[PDB]
Amino acid sequence: MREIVHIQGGQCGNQIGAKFWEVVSDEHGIDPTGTYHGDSDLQLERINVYFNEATGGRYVPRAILMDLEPGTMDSVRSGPYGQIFRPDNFVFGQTGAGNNWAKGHYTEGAELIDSVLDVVRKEAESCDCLQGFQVCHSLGGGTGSGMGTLLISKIREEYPDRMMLTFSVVPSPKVSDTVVEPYNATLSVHQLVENADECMVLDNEALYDICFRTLKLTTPTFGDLNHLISAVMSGITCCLRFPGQLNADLRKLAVNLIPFPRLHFFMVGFTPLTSRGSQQYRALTVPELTQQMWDAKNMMCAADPRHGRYLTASALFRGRMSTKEVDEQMLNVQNKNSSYFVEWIPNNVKSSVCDIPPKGLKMSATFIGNSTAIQEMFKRVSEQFTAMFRRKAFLHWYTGEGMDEMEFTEAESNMNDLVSEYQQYQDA
């Protein structure tokens, strides 16, 4: 059981989903024809988490692709693994997004929700035990912010007990591929806080460094960044998919990582990561994986954990290892940099492990962290928003969809209330 339904919002969310659905399709050893050609029974025991049966021993992904302007949905359909998707799981509208949160959430969103919500339900009963949802966002654009959160609100009012994950990719502090970016960021934040349970934040910047220094990449394309996010997206559900001497469902990750109903913004990083050079020198040992993930580089979020304090943390390994090593490693670190952790939480880490490794490697890891340094991102965005709202720049677009200004006041107040909360439990 524990079936997982998947959403892919906006261009980026549609695009990283092309990799995540291409990596997993290989980890379980199926062909782009949809026919399984792996070797073991373990690929088939929990295959139900990401797929459905089909006629002729075929498996199709339980994914839903939503995007205005279906231009890009042709690309993934023309990609090498576009043949596996159910072409009725392609919901789109011809009119563009305009990078306006409003029409993405007031006018054009509303006209597609009825179709989407009909699709989501069409595969919610197909799950004998629906574990939870998971989405891929981008807060800068119009569809991702607008449609996703509007889609998110609809999910919560009909699936409240389940859990709403969010692989949201945030705007960048220094870079701005668009101009109205902070608006759609804050307007979504006013929606994520109240209709979500866990929300990882990731940013293209650290994604460029992690590509640059560690992997020694010269030309980081977009697929590679998504190739990374595909990895950490697969690193999460190894407990739901594969055996493990200490398994970890998502619902136990949430209760182990969020003490309060609103401190639910996370941070991620992958391990191991090495070029073709050092992999011929470096050895795979439990010590290797834990120092790399614990570092402040691999944090794909553009935040510095040293300026904050880890409320909680977690680690997801995979490969045959001595669990005692991992037991003491997290106990060593919890002692050395005792300032970066909190006091009223005695042991603030969860140490999971799985018995099945990645495909080509033999060991791997993944870091999660709920630090208060993530409030730094909300400080930057709250500045840019209040700078232009101080001048009502670009605002005629937003009131051009029935919107008002109180919403711009409300969303900012909530952002201030939020970042304040991450300061209370930050006693330096």
Place this chain on the structure above:
Amino acid sequence: MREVISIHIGQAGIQVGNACWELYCLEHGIQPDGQMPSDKTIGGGDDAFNTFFSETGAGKHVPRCIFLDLEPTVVDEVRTGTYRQLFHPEQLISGKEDAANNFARGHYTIGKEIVDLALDRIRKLADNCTGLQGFLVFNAVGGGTGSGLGSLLLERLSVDYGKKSKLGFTVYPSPQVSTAVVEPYNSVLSTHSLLEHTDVAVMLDNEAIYDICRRSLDIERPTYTNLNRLIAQVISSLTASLRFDGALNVDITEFQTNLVPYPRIHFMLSSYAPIISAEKAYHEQLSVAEITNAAFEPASMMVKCDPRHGKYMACCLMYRGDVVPKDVNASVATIKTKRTIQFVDWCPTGFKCGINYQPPTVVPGGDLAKVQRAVCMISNSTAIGEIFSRLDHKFDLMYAKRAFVHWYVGEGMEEGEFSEAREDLAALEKDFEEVG
């Protein structure tokens, strides 16, 4: 699906209408006789041209444009030129008499009789499109048709659609070089009635592009075809996202939302790079860094406006060919480090960029070179008010003398439209100072 309507009014409008419609038919393999090789399903290529064409019941591709002009001599030339098998003669519109550099003659007396014909062809053309991205006007401020007819049209369009976006590339009367003498008047009269009806407005002048072909291309014999050859290159760079792929595709709605902060402030500038001949391309590597440097250069602008006396409210850069977005992120950072480049406070953002993998295509016998890269920039800066103010000075310099005004009041006008449009000039200008 993603289709636009390119209107060409006046003489210059139907001059650039030649170059662009020479460029487009070449990038897509469209032969002058409507068709192209491997046209049917044998080619396996669709959507590559629908933005600019309408495949017939079989084979031929008619360009979706409109040539409008009161002077019969030029429209009759295209009817005789090589590119006659392209245009359906319902598009090519003419008239017995011209406007003769009077606004009323283009706006009050003659224009009222042919606009209905124009609207009828547009309505014949609008219904053929499934998804209409936006109108694309090509005006030439400084004449009777352009100021007169274009302005009258935009009013008719807005009361028809309203919901549709309007976009226009209009050549403005240069400060120094002036082929006409009364162009200040109609220019004033054009600026107003377009403003409350156009949604965005790009501006550029021949004198600036006269230097461009001089400094960079190093040609000493510039004529109207060369300037129009460049405008072809500019717009092909813009529409590329509408009609091709590449990272960070942009449509007009996306492009327009993040470039117009306030309803009135929409007047913008332009620039292209690289601008080189065949031999310099041999002695050059064309890294994304230099190309984005020559882009923001105030010399390479296409209008005689100095942005170093104002602040960029926003910017938009459309690269082309082989670019990867780290480089854009890399180089755009470098600019934001510099000092000569100013921005108004309330926008910490300001860059809506875009890439397209399809290369820039050169025209045979043309002047530009074959390159794997290029950039076109469009910045809405508040420094644009200066050239808006020179004309503010030439109007009262003549309107005081009341020179040439008898033509206008004699052709079904009054003095009110001078004062009425005069105040809008000042009213606009102060808005360019309120943003400081």
Place this chain on the structure above:
Amino acid sequence: AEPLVLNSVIGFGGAIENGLIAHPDGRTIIYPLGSTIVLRDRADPRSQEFLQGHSDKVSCLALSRSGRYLASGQITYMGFTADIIIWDLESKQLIHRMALHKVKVQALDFSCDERFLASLGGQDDNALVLWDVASGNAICGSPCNTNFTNCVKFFNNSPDKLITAGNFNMNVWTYDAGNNKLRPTDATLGTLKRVFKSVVVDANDEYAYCGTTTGDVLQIALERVLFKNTGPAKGNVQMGVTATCEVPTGDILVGGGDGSLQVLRTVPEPSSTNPKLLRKMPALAGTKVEGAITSIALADMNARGFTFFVGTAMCNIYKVTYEPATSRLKEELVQTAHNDKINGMAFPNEYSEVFATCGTGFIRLWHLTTCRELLRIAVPNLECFCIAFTTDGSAILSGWSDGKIRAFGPQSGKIIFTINDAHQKAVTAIASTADSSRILSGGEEGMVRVWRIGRTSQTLEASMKDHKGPVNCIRIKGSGDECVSASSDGSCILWDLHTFKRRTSLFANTFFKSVVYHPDESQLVTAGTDRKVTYWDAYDGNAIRIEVNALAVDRDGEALVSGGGDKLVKLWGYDEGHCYFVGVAHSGAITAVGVTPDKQRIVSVGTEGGIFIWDYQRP
């Protein structure tokens, strides 16, 4: 090393319309197989030359005039281009490999000039394309219409126009010279809606004849394409006209979808009663052949008449000699072939001259020295599995997809017995004791059973041996009493069958397809999904470990012969383990292999619907 002489191959591509061809003024018959083309001698039914260049399966076949090179279409998967291939003659190798028609190829034809080759897209992507032969490149292309066409034909003269017919449309297309276009002209028929299937053109482009699912044979003029005469008077073809051809004398051979093969003389006649009216086409001669007729090719004997090679949907090839002198039409059956997916092979014990093939419709019996199949015991609907000979020389056991076993004899007479509900559904493997006293049946719903059998009284005992998955194979020691059951879980189990207590043997790395004893030894050889030919110990061990489906051994353990999903056949010195004498060109997933005990012959059979014979030499 690949020394393995291919002595005989029996097979035929049945439902490939117009697939059968005769070499013009040649000594070869051309017809398709699972994925290959076969050129047999016209006379010596041994000299075969096969052409294998396709990946999935040949779909259409066209042969240009003057014995020049021939084109072959192909079916492919859902979203991957088809592959038209031009094969040279006088050299018998590939020339061009053209790719379009993303779903499949529907029709191909050469022009009278061998310079043009026209193709027709599949159900989807149905368009008409022209190809050049010097440059394997598409000259012209155009989509016909929504009602997808079925067949296309170049005009016998003026190789510049071609007629094509389909569901509710007929057109004549002329290739324009000024461009890369071809202009169609539609057919005008008076309030007639006919699903045209086959189309032929006369010698002089006067009249195009076109079959119909209704059964008519509409003849139309071609100067203007309008319609002229309906079809066969005094009745109507039963299953609609399918295989139509023209005899040089001006008449037409028509073969319907039931086996009715007749001759219609088509000369415009006036209606006797009403002078200004025409008659319908009469029928000179008529005959009945077995099965729906699908392909007709000509052979000019000219002594009395003409000999037409007629390929029927039942994979039978007929030689129809017709002489219009006395209007006499006599047919002969030259060669027969199985239908599709031959399931099981069987050899009678201590007999290396006759064998039996269980297929998806019924059981056929063949012999060694010649094809010359002996009999076909028919069971209408449900298919046979795992044919078996009762030991020492006795009845034939056959378990069917019904879940029932039935016994037949040599002449096989009437059913010896029917063990019904032998399993839940689809009994899959069947074996007998060395004493012919009990019969093992391993079903598809993961169960094994055994039935005691007396002389005229059957005994239905309740063994109920539970297994973990479908039983691919079941073997028993002819020396003593034991049992081995393979599985679609690979856990080959040794049953004792003295106490029926499942001697605890288990082999689990993947799921297996074929297991064999070493003759008079405690060894084992098993074959499953992963390439594994591991030698086991009967004493719970694995001597050695070296997509495979079928295994076989000689009298003693000399040469383990093997095959599988790969289209090859691997022979092995059993004790040494080298792959000497490997054979190729079995276009499909090979299913079974046999050794012909007394002699040195390896028979191979797969899902393609064919059977192959090789010699046997081991170092």
